Amino acid sequence: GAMFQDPQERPRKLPQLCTELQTTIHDIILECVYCKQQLLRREVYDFARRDLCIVYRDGNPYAVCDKCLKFYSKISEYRHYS
Ligand SMILES: [Zn+2]
């Protein structure tokens, strides 16, 4: 449910991404990069309520779901590009 293409270069931060989508966290479709399940809006809040970074699976914006959040909370904005 999340396939983001140019010129939507995509950020790494959730509130910023919401800007790209011209919307807010309260609306944004962000899924698990890993589980492909759309995050519960509460979990989507977790992301910006803390200091996590968005993870693009291949090149689409996904958040890190409930399960993955505890796993990948270590990653707080990484420069893994290309
Ligand atoms: Zn997940």
Tab-separated table of N, CA and C and ligand atoms in Angstrom:
chain	number	residue	atom	x	y	z
A	1	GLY	N	0.801	-1.215	0.000
A	1	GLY	CA	0.000	0.000	0.000
A	1	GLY	C	0.836	1.268	0.000
A	2	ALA	N	2.147	1.147	-0.180
A	2	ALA	CA	3.012	2.305	-0.209
A	2	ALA	C	4.050	2.161	-1.319
A	3	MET	N	3.901	2.961	-2.355
A	3	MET	CA	4.794	2.941	-3.506
A	3	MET	C	5.032	4.391	-3.909
A	4	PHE	N	6.147	4.930	-3.461
A	4	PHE	CA	6.483	6.322	-3.649
A	4	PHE	C	7.553	6.496	-4.739
A	5	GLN	N	7.251	7.299	-5.722
A	5	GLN	CA	8.136	7.550	-6.846
A	5	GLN	C	8.501	9.055	-6.905
A	6	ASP	N	9.500	9.373	-7.720
A	6	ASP	CA	9.986	10.744	-8.014
A	6	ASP	C	8.822	11.677	-8.412
A	7	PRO	N	8.868	13.018	-8.081
A	7	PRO	CA	10.033	13.739	-7.456
A	7	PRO	C	10.036	13.699	-5.956
A	8	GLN	N	9.282	12.817	-5.497
A	8	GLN	CA	9.138	12.492	-4.115
A	8	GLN	C	10.317	11.634	-3.742
A	9	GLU	N	11.413	12.312	-3.640
A	9	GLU	CA	12.744	11.783	-3.325
A	9	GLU	C	12.806	10.970	-2.035
A	10	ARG	N	11.822	11.175	-1.218
A	10	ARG	CA	11.610	10.482	0.064
A	10	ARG	C	12.663	10.895	1.135
A	11	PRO	N	12.216	11.255	2.346
A	11	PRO	CA	13.113	11.606	3.459
A	11	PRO	C	13.565	10.361	4.201
A	12	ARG	N	13.901	10.534	5.448
A	12	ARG	CA	14.126	9.462	6.347
A	12	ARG	C	13.356	9.682	7.616
A	13	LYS	N	12.669	10.811	7.722
A	13	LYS	CA	11.907	11.065	8.895
A	13	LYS	C	10.434	11.067	8.583
A	14	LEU	N	9.671	10.502	9.476
A	14	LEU	CA	8.236	10.370	9.350
A	14	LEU	C	7.472	11.714	9.174
A	15	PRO	N	7.679	12.745	10.050
A	15	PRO	CA	6.914	14.002	9.959
A	15	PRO	C	7.231	14.739	8.657
A	16	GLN	N	8.463	14.594	8.234
A	16	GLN	CA	8.935	15.154	7.007
A	16	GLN	C	8.295	14.459	5.815
A	17	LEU	N	8.193	13.134	5.868
A	17	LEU	CA	7.580	12.369	4.807
A	17	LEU	C	6.144	12.758	4.641
A	18	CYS	N	5.498	12.982	5.744
A	18	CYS	CA	4.120	13.404	5.743
A	18	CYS	C	3.957	14.697	4.920
A	19	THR	N	4.962	15.553	4.981
A	19	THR	CA	5.018	16.765	4.198
A	19	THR	C	5.004	16.440	2.689
A	20	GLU	N	5.839	15.484	2.277
A	20	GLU	CA	5.869	14.982	0.933
A	20	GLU	C	4.497	14.513	0.466
A	21	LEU	N	3.858	13.705	1.285
A	21	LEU	CA	2.526	13.224	1.048
A	21	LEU	C	1.457	14.283	1.255
A	22	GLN	N	1.874	15.489	1.652
A	22	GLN	CA	0.983	16.638	1.827
A	22	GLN	C	-0.075	16.352	2.884
A	23	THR	N	0.266	15.513	3.806
A	23	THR	CA	-0.665	15.066	4.765
A	23	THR	C	0.037	14.933	6.124
A	24	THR	N	-0.592	14.302	7.072
A	24	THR	CA	0.016	14.133	8.354
A	24	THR	C	0.066	12.643	8.718
A	25	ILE	N	0.660	12.341	9.875
A	25	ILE	CA	0.839	10.988	10.396
A	25	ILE	C	-0.502	10.269	10.552
A	26	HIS	N	-1.493	11.077	10.684
A	26	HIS	CA	-2.833	10.713	11.032
A	26	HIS	C	-3.554	10.177	9.805
A	27	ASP	N	-2.893	10.294	8.675
A	27	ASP	CA	-3.462	9.923	7.401
A	27	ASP	C	-2.513	9.046	6.593
A	28	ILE	N	-1.223	9.379	6.652
A	28	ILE	CA	-0.148	8.704	5.894
A	28	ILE	C	-0.194	7.176	5.925
A	29	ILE	N	-0.031	6.589	4.763
A	29	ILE	CA	0.080	5.197	4.657
A	29	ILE	C	1.506	4.803	4.639
A	30	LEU	N	1.898	4.235	5.726
A	30	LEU	CA	3.192	3.767	5.902
A	30	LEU	C	3.111	2.349	6.256
A	31	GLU	N	3.865	1.493	5.632
A	31	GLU	CA	3.693	0.095	6.087
A	31	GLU	C	4.915	-0.482	6.689
A	32	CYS	N	4.903	-1.735	7.116
A	32	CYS	CA	6.116	-2.324	7.493
A	32	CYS	C	6.879	-2.678	6.255
A	33	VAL	N	8.041	-2.177	6.215
A	33	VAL	CA	9.036	-2.459	5.205
A	33	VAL	C	9.291	-3.983	5.157
A	34	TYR	N	9.248	-4.569	6.291
A	34	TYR	CA	9.562	-5.949	6.471
A	34	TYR	C	8.305	-6.836	6.379
A	35	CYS	N	7.250	-6.487	7.137
A	35	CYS	CA	6.073	-7.362	7.275
A	35	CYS	C	4.986	-7.046	6.261
A	36	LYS	N	5.136	-5.909	5.604
A	36	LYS	CA	4.245	-5.392	4.577
A	36	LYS	C	2.834	-5.088	5.087
A	37	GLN	N	2.682	-5.078	6.382
A	37	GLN	CA	1.483	-4.749	6.976
A	37	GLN	C	1.486	-3.294	7.348
A	38	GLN	N	0.452	-2.622	6.971
A	38	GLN	CA	0.256	-1.252	7.260
A	38	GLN	C	0.265	-1.056	8.755
A	39	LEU	N	1.065	-0.137	9.209
A	39	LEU	CA	1.147	0.141	10.606
A	39	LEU	C	-0.125	0.699	11.153
A	40	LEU	N	-0.448	0.248	12.340
A	40	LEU	CA	-1.503	0.765	13.120
A	40	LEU	C	-1.138	2.197	13.365
A	41	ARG	N	-2.053	3.107	13.178
A	41	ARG	CA	-1.775	4.534	13.322
A	41	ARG	C	-1.056	4.868	14.655
A	42	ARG	N	-1.349	4.099	15.714
A	42	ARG	CA	-0.666	4.219	16.985
A	42	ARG	C	0.822	3.932	16.816
A	43	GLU	N	1.123	2.863	16.100
A	43	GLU	CA	2.509	2.451	15.822
A	43	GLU	C	3.186	3.465	14.921
A	44	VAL	N	2.407	4.060	14.027
A	44	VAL	CA	2.933	5.086	13.152
A	44	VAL	C	3.339	6.293	14.017
A	45	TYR	N	2.527	6.614	15.034
A	45	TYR	CA	2.880	7.672	15.980
A	45	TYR	C	4.159	7.366	16.717
A	46	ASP	N	4.357	6.106	17.100
A	46	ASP	CA	5.557	5.642	17.823
A	46	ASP	C	6.810	6.047	17.131
A	47	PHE	N	6.734	6.043	15.859
A	47	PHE	CA	7.830	6.312	15.018
A	47	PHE	C	8.309	7.768	15.195
A	48	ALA	N	7.378	8.720	15.092
A	48	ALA	CA	7.712	10.143	15.241
A	48	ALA	C	7.701	10.569	16.695
A	49	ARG	N	7.071	9.771	17.559
A	49	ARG	CA	7.042	10.083	18.977
A	49	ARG	C	8.380	9.754	19.605
A	50	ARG	N	9.176	9.026	18.855
A	50	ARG	CA	10.528	8.733	19.177
A	50	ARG	C	11.415	9.321	18.077
A	51	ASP	N	12.555	8.722	17.817
A	51	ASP	CA	13.511	9.304	16.893
A	51	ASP	C	13.953	8.308	15.833
A	52	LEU	N	13.054	7.430	15.443
A	52	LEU	CA	13.360	6.414	14.444
A	52	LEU	C	13.474	7.014	13.037
A	53	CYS	N	13.828	6.188	12.091
A	53	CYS	CA	13.958	6.612	10.730
A	53	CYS	C	13.214	5.669	9.844
A	54	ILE	N	12.789	6.165	8.731
A	54	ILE	CA	12.055	5.399	7.791
A	54	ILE	C	12.939	4.556	6.964
A	55	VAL	N	12.436	3.429	6.726
A	55	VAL	CA	13.067	2.396	6.057
A	55	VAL	C	12.320	2.094	4.788
A	56	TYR	N	12.985	2.280	3.736
A	56	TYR	CA	12.463	2.048	2.463
A	56	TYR	C	12.823	0.695	2.048
A	57	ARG	N	11.831	-0.084	1.821
A	57	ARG	CA	12.097	-1.422	1.344
A	57	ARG	C	12.193	-1.252	-0.144
A	58	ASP	N	13.388	-1.467	-0.694
A	58	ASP	CA	13.701	-1.306	-2.143
A	58	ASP	C	13.714	0.168	-2.549
A	59	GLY	N	12.636	0.855	-2.254
A	59	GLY	CA	12.547	2.255	-2.502
A	59	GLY	C	11.163	2.801	-2.250
A	60	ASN	N	10.496	2.289	-1.223
A	60	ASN	CA	9.143	2.746	-0.881
A	60	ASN	C	9.111	2.959	0.613
A	61	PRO	N	8.320	3.905	1.135
A	61	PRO	CA	8.363	4.257	2.539
A	61	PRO	C	7.543	3.389	3.508
A	62	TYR	N	8.265	2.874	4.381
A	62	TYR	CA	7.694	2.096	5.278
A	62	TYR	C	8.247	2.408	6.587
A	63	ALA	N	7.446	2.215	7.477
A	63	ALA	CA	7.704	2.364	8.792
A	63	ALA	C	8.191	1.029	9.322
A	64	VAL	N	8.324	0.955	10.575
A	64	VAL	CA	8.756	-0.217	11.232
A	64	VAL	C	7.652	-0.576	12.218
A	65	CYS	N	6.952	-1.694	11.947
A	65	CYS	CA	5.785	-2.099	12.740
A	65	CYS	C	6.105	-2.393	14.224
A	66	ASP	N	5.043	-2.706	14.984
A	66	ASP	CA	5.084	-3.034	16.444
A	66	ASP	C	6.193	-4.024	16.776
A	67	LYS	N	6.234	-5.092	16.013
A	67	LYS	CA	7.168	-6.175	16.222
A	67	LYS	C	8.578	-5.752	15.878
A	68	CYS	N	8.721	-5.140	14.738
A	68	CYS	CA	10.004	-4.742	14.236
A	68	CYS	C	10.587	-3.544	15.000
A	69	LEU	N	9.728	-2.706	15.548
A	69	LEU	CA	10.115	-1.517	16.250
A	69	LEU	C	11.050	-1.812	17.405
A	70	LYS	N	10.813	-2.896	18.099
A	70	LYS	CA	11.670	-3.259	19.209
A	70	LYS	C	13.008	-3.815	18.702
A	71	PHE	N	12.991	-4.400	17.517
A	71	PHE	CA	14.152	-4.957	16.908
A	71	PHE	C	15.056	-3.870	16.327
A	72	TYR	N	14.450	-2.974	15.577
A	72	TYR	CA	15.164	-2.011	14.777
A	72	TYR	C	15.201	-0.615	15.380
A	73	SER	N	14.857	-0.492	16.654
A	73	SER	CA	14.906	0.793	17.360
A	73	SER	C	16.352	1.313	17.483
A	74	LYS	N	17.291	0.396	17.297
A	74	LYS	CA	18.718	0.663	17.285
A	74	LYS	C	19.058	1.630	16.153
A	75	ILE	N	18.370	1.471	15.057
A	75	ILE	CA	18.603	2.275	13.882
A	75	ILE	C	17.833	3.581	13.996
A	76	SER	N	18.521	4.642	14.281
A	76	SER	CA	17.884	5.917	14.325
A	76	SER	C	18.555	6.871	13.326
A	77	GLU	N	18.092	6.757	12.090
A	77	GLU	CA	18.549	7.506	10.922
A	77	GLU	C	19.899	7.021	10.441
A	78	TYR	N	19.863	6.280	9.366
A	78	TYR	CA	21.032	5.664	8.830
A	78	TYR	C	21.248	6.189	7.414
A	79	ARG	N	22.466	6.103	6.917
A	79	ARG	CA	22.821	6.648	5.621
A	79	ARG	C	23.047	5.533	4.632
A	80	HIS	N	22.230	4.518	4.747
A	80	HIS	CA	22.285	3.400	3.842
A	80	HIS	C	21.596	3.737	2.529
A	81	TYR	N	22.373	4.199	1.596
A	81	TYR	CA	21.856	4.689	0.351
A	81	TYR	C	22.384	3.927	-0.836
A	82	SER	N	21.611	3.972	-1.914
A	82	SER	CA	21.857	3.233	-3.135
A	82	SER	C	21.752	1.727	-2.855
B	1	ZN	ZN	7.372	-5.562	10.845
